[PDB]
Amino acid sequence: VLSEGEWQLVLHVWAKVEADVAGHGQDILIRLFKSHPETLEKFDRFKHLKTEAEMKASEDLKKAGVTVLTALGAILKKKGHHEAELKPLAQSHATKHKIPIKYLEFISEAIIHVLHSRHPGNFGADAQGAMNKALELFRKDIAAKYKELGYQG
């Protein structure tokens, strides 16, 4: 369970993300696809992209970046009260997309890396710890849902 102070460190960096969610989402998905290229194979729309330049030019990847971060943002804003948001996400990621928990760890790492690079003003050690704790909570709850849904993750 996060404290309110922890949640406020999360939401104060999120506020900066939201100056330009598309740009943040592009950087985060590119980081994921560069650090763990195997993750690209989950995407019919993107498994063909060969280079960071191709990724940066992809309007579909930019839209995806907006989607992921907006959905995550809505979860974070619930401050742990996110059962309703996690239901459809778990179901789609478990059953249709087949996203293992390891890959949710990889995108969490990508988010942290990008925020640390972009936002040293709002992503010092305390703030990074709070974001890691929010992301770990998210992954714990999603994994519990995966199990309920019949997917080992």
Ligand X SMILES: C[C@H](Cc1ccccc1)N=O
Residue nearest to ligand HEM (CB): 92
30 binds ligand X (CB under 6 A): no
Q: What residues from 35 to 64 belong to the interface with ligand HEM (CB under 6 A)? A: 39, 42-45
95 binds ligand X (CB under 6 A): no
Could you write out the three-class secondary structure of 10-59? Answer: HHHHHHHHCCCHHHHHHHHHHHHHHHCHHHHHHCCCCCCCCCHHHHHHCH
Query: On the CB side of 98, how many CA atoms lie within 13 Å of its CA?
Result: 6
Q: Which is nearer to ligand X, 16 or 42 (CB)?
A: 42
64 binds ligand X (CB under 6 A): yes
Binding site for ligand X (CB under 6 A): 64, 67-68
